[PDB]
Every structure is written in structure tokens, then in C-alpha cells.
Design a protein around this ligand. Structure first.
Ligand SMILES: Nc1ncnc2c1ncn2[C@@H]1O[C@H](CSCC[C@H](N)C(=O)O)[C@@H](O)[C@H]1O
Ligand SMILES: Cc1ccc(S(=O)(=O)c2cc(F)c(O)c3ncccc23)cc1
Ligand SMILES: [Mg+2]
Length: 212
């Protein structure tokens, strides 16, 4: 029995099936009252929601799924026919994420890509018929934000206006990524100050819009 299975179980026992909002509130309740967990959370999740509604992306890439909280957060706001692809290298986690998506009724919109982003990113065009990405949610290991950003650009997956949205740019921090995008003329950056999931530690999201 893992913490991730206990979270999935609490959702199955308490959330309304096919109701993504109630799945979200159930994860946040369990992690606020019983076990902290690295979901993006409700405070940063609300900023995510606002960014998603602004840009209405047709194709979203997520780096790091964990238990599916953030994929459920974004997919429930996608237009009909919009797609989310989420890369997760831990097979236990990816199996929890698939079950969470199934319970929320979002299976049709989300495709789990089992593996490490650095291996899966060069296969996006061929194996998933991707031209360019409309939005990227970066929320995996912090030492990969900058390498995977450089890899996305190298593989031709970015276009003018592609929205990169990065979690944890303050805590635990992504200093090289943050320095890179803020100093690069290829990105227009905005910082959204918030709080670490289920805590009052300051954290924030960085939005970095590729400029071509
Ligand atoms: N190189 C990589 N490729 C794919 N997944 C990765 C990765 N490095 C870390 N991960 C995964 O990144 C996840 C970070 S936690 C992600 C939480 C999720 N975005 C949410 O907000 O609910 C972990 O599950 C870890 O296994
Ligand atoms: C098992 C485990 C627990 C905590 C951490 S972590 O690096 O502390 C961390 C904290 C956090 F708030 C986040 O949102 C995170 N998102 C993505 C990856 C790490 C995150 C890594 C692994
Ligand atoms: Mg995070």
C-alpha cells in the first residue's frame, strides 16, 4: 500500500464518478487532512485554470503526471476535441493516473505517455501526430525544466505563442530554467506568485511564451 494508492482509494470512496471537480476536491481534502503530496494543488491550480481559459489550447503537453491531479485539472477545461498528453516515467504513478482519469470521465481527452520526457519528446511528432504544442505544463524533476525546454525547441514542437507554464519556480526552485527564459529574447515571461500545495510556503508559476 502506497500513498498514491491511498489517494486513489479515497477518491473512489468519496468523489462523484465522472465529476472532475469532485475528484479534485477529494484529492485536495485527503492531502490537506491526512498526507501531503506533490499535486499542484488548488491555490496554484486556480491560476492554472485562469491561464487555460485565457488561451484555450487545443494540444497540451504535461511533464509529470504523478496521480493525475493536474491532468484532471487541465483536461476538464479543454474544449471538445482538445487533447492533453502527459509524460510520466514512474509506472506505478502512471497506473494511478490512468485510474484517476478513468474515474473522472476524462479518459477520452488524456493520453498517458509512459517514460521519461527526454526519451518521449523526440517521438511526439511520429507516434502521436503532433505538429506544435499550444501549451506545456512543466512539473517533473526540476533539473529537467531547462533541458526539456531546449529539447522541445530542437524537435520543432514550439511555435510563436506556445505557452510554457512552469510549477515550483520558487520552491523547490528551477533556477537555471528561470534564469534562462527570463533572459532569453525567445520568451516573454510572467510570474504568478502563489503558495506551495497544501502549505503557506511561497511558491509561484512562471508563464514563458515562446516568441519564435
Ligand atoms: N523526466 C521525466 N519524465 C517523465 N516524468 C517525470 C520525469 N521526471 C519526473 N517525472 C515525474 O514527475 C512527477 C512530478 S509530480 C507531478 C504532479 C502533477 N503535475 C500534479 O500537479 O498533480 C513525478 O510523478 C515523477 O515521476
Ligand atoms: C516524492 C517526492 C516528493 C517531493 C518532491 S519535491 O521535489 O519536493 C516537489 C515538491 C512540490 F511541491 C512539487 O509540486 C513538486 N512537483 C514535481 C516534482 C517535485 C515536487 C519530489 C519527490
Ligand atoms: Mg509541482
Amino acid at each position: 500500500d502506497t500513498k498514491e494508492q491511498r489517494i486513489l482509494r479515497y477518491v473512489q470512496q468519496n468523489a462523484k464518478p465522472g465529476d472532475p471537480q469532485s475528484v479534485l476536491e477529494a484529492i485536495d481534502t485527503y492531502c490537506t487532512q491526512k498526507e501531503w503530496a506533490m499535486n499542484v494543488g488548488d491555490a496554484k491550480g486556480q491560476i492554472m485554470d485562469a491561464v487555460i481559459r485565457e488561451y484555450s489550447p487545443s494540444l497540451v503537453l504535461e511533464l509529470g503526471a504523478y496521480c493525475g491531479y493536474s491532468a484532471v485539472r487541465m483536461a476538464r477545461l479543454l474544449q471538445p476535441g482538445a487533447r492533453l498528453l502527459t509524460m510520466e516515467m514512474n509506472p506505478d504513478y502512471a497506473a494511478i493516473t490512468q485510474q484517476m482519469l478513468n474515474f473522472a470521465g476524462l479518459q477520452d481527452k488524456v493520453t498517458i505517455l509512459n517514460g521519461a520526457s527526454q526519451d518521449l519528446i523526440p517521438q511526439l511528432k511520429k507516434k502521436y501526430d503532433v505538429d506544435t504544442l499550444d501549451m506545456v505544463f512543466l512539473d517533473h524533476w526540476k533539473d529537467r525544466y531547462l533541458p526539456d525546454t531546449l529539447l522541445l525547441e530542437k524537435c520543432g514542437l514550439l511555435r510563436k505563442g506556445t505557452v510554457l507554464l512552469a510549477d515550483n519556480v520558487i520552491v523547490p526552485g528551477t533556477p537555471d530554467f528561470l534564469a534562462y527564459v527570463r533572459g532569453s529574447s525567445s520568451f516573454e515571461c510572467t510570474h504568478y506568485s502563489s503558495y506551495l500545495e497544501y502549505m503557506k510556503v511561497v511558491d509561484g508559476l512562471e508563464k514563458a511564451i515562446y516568441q519564435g
